Design a protein around this ligand. Structure first.
Ligand SMILES: [Mg+2]
Ligand SMILES: [Mg+2]
Ligand SMILES: [Mg+2]
Lengths: 278, 283
């Protein structure tokens, strides 16, 4: 059973969310199996950012057991701005554990992170949630000379999940969502003074087969990383508590995590309310 | 100074928000002046629903001092559903006090029927408002929605404290600084009740927003109707509670009605059913 352990108040520098397995913290990057049901292509998704929120929460590659923390820019908490007609993130946003885009069709290098996941179901997720999802398709975003693969997925518990099997089903049951996704990832950093991003494949979402191939490739890259066999381990903390055949296994790491110290959410500056027309 | 007095937990049937002046409840319908600065057409807006929320909170016409309470559908709490690409309400949404769309007036040429409520206000500024907030706004324009045979005027307004307020003076400025917002507004009010099993609504003027000059005259008309109502001179006041604490020339004036309101009993927001998360694709 997966649960979460929160340290600190949300929307602060001290906020951390660890994933627990049966009460014990594990690495959100390394210790959560990619596959919930390998034979049926059911994946575990680690949720970072609930739909319609702004705080840029991410699995932290650099900290032991890779808790989810709010990203920072030169010491300041990072929030995505609201880009009309959108409110914060327009998907439940997260990552597949045990995947890694090694930075060494899109002609842009890996981004050094787990593959990104856009979960499109009705229910708003929570930070640190492990949910089970099916892959529907995939887009390739080009941001600052790196490829960021975005897997389109749905919670298998969603009422519509049985009717959604491949990318064409998203156009049928969620008309306009793929267009909104294209627009959002193109423009979401413009309010921060960064350039418009671009998609490979003229913004096309490739199908489930294509998605499964990319997922598998990035899982294979992760296997090389965690075995200590990658060229550059990039200051990624590879500490893990479920993989004893790896050089960075450490059973002790779980008990070293402080107890939950859950505080009320800290206020967010009212500037984050602003709707940008860009 | 206007403040709020909350009774109960948000998102429950018991929740009420009274508007206070000097720490004492006043009528949110009758006692807040329409004009903050009449000379310059600066209005007081009563905010009911913050942008990007779902709970259908409204000034309650039939309750003494007209607190804001969540509307019900056959007694069940009403939440507006999320209609892609929108999240909840896309404006800070509320009303002008001391206005009333009189439902008793015959408009035989237009066949328009007033909706029996204060005139609705869409406030377009950057900051998300709070329920029961009294903010000062400039009117920019107006739209006319037809919903189930009733005309609902929607005033387009901006908080005078918004950084853009000095640059927003008439309806055309909204398209300049908020491109696409008026088009989205048209869509929103057309479709927002479809997930509830109601028809698509229609706008007059093929959805065009009339300008400030046109808007002021509609607002004036609804203020005139309210003056008749609060004087006890409407041919049918529809069980509206006309109790007020600031209008001595009215028959239902009573400063002491304020004292009868219970003290604040603010509780933490109640959870909202997860169904309200759902995003509806109307296509
Ligand atoms: Mg990521
Ligand atoms: Mg009505
Ligand atoms: Mg109204």
């Amino acid at each position: 059973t997966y649960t979460t352990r929160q340290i600190g108040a949300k929307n602060t520098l001290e906020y951390k969310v660890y994933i627990e397995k049966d009460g014990k913290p594990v690495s959100a990057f390394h210790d959560i199996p990619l596959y919930a049901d390998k034979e049926n292509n059911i994946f575990n998704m680690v949720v970072e950012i609930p739909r319609w929120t702004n705080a840029k929460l991410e699995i932290t590659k650099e900290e032991t057991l890779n808790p989810i923390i709010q990203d920072t820019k030169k010491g300041k908490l990072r929030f995505v701005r609201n880009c009309f007609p959108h409110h914060g993130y327009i998907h439940n946003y997260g990552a597949f554990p045990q995947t890694w885009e090694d930075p060494n069709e899109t002609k842009a290098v890996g981004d050094n992170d787990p593959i990104d996941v856009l979960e499109i179901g009705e229910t708003i997720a929570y930070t640190g949630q492990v949910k089970q999802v099916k892959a529907l398709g995939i887009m390739a975003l080009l941001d600052e000379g790196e490829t960021e693969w975005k897997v389109i997925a749905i919670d298998i518990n969603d009422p519509l999940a049985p009717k959604l099997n491949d990318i064409e089903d998203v156009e049928k049951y969620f008309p306009g969502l793929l267009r909104a996704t294209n627009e959002w990832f193109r423009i979401y950093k413009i309010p921060d003074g960064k350039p418009e991003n671009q998609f490979a494949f003229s913004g096309e979402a490739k199908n489930k087969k294509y998605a499964l191939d990319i997922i598998k490739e990035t899982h294979d890259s992760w296997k090389q990383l965690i075995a200590g066999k990658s060229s550059d381990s990039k200051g990624i903390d590879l500490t893990n508590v479920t993989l004893p055949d790896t050089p960075t296994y450490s059973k002790a790491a779980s008990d070293a995590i402080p107890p939950a110290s859950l505080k009320a959410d800290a206020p967010i500056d009212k500037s984050i309310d602003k709707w940008f027309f860009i």
